[PDB]
């Protein structure tokens, strides 16, 4: 019997795939988000503060 693949199998996409967002995602904050401060925060003073008394 024919042992090979079917070269005429439906090659197109599926136009009836589920077109919705997943109602069961992971609805939580990330506990492993970077908890540290930014070392590259601008360490210079602001030259645009008010120069008047």
């Amino acid at each position: 019997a024919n042992p090979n693949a079917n070269p005429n199998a439906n090659p197109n996409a599926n136009p009836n795939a589920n077109p919705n967002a997943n109602p069961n995602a992971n609805p939580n904050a990330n506990p492993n988000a970077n908890p540290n401060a930014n070392p590259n925060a601008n360490p210079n003073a602001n030259p645009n503060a008010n120069p008047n008394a």
Partner: antibody
Amino acid sequence: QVQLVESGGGVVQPGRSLRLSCAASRLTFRNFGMHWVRQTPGKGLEWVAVIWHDGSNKFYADSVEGRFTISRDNSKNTLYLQMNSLRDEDTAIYYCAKDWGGASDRVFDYWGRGTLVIVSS
Amino acid sequence: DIQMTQSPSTLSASVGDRVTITCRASQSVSTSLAWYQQKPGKAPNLLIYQASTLYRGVPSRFSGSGSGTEFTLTIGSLQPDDFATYYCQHYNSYSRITFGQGTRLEIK
């Protein structure tokens, strides 16, 4: 034209303390942050520390956390770094620096010459 | 910390040609990259910030490009005074500053 003079180096034994100074000249020290950069004998540049414009916040690299202490004195125009509990890997030419001053750019413009510290016995 | 790798480590060229030096990032740095050139006996001087912007006083033959992890510093025409060690430095937010190994460009 802004030249950074750094000093206080020499040869120290492992585990002993040492003080480095970065006295400035004609640069507005107070309104600019400062950086220490370590250039290893193997031709590599490692960032060391940065101090804010008024000393409010202070950051270090992981390899120098807790063993290095930097301080900023606006009064006599100098940046200070106290160097403690050393071993062999800290033997390198130590560069002073000055962040350019951009809103989000941590880039050095006016580098210092460098003061070389030896850890040996 | 980000290991900031620049390739090739050493590339030889003669005056007048086009030479490009790139630097690889372990993970995305967006466009917070900087380039420094270090002639022997002198501290490195900045050329490019924001990975594409030429610093003041930088000759126009100096040029930076790239984003993410792939960046390129391109030389418009190599000059006799452009022979030194070149470094790539990133200042990504929430990350510590690291430098590259240093690429050496050598005569002929």
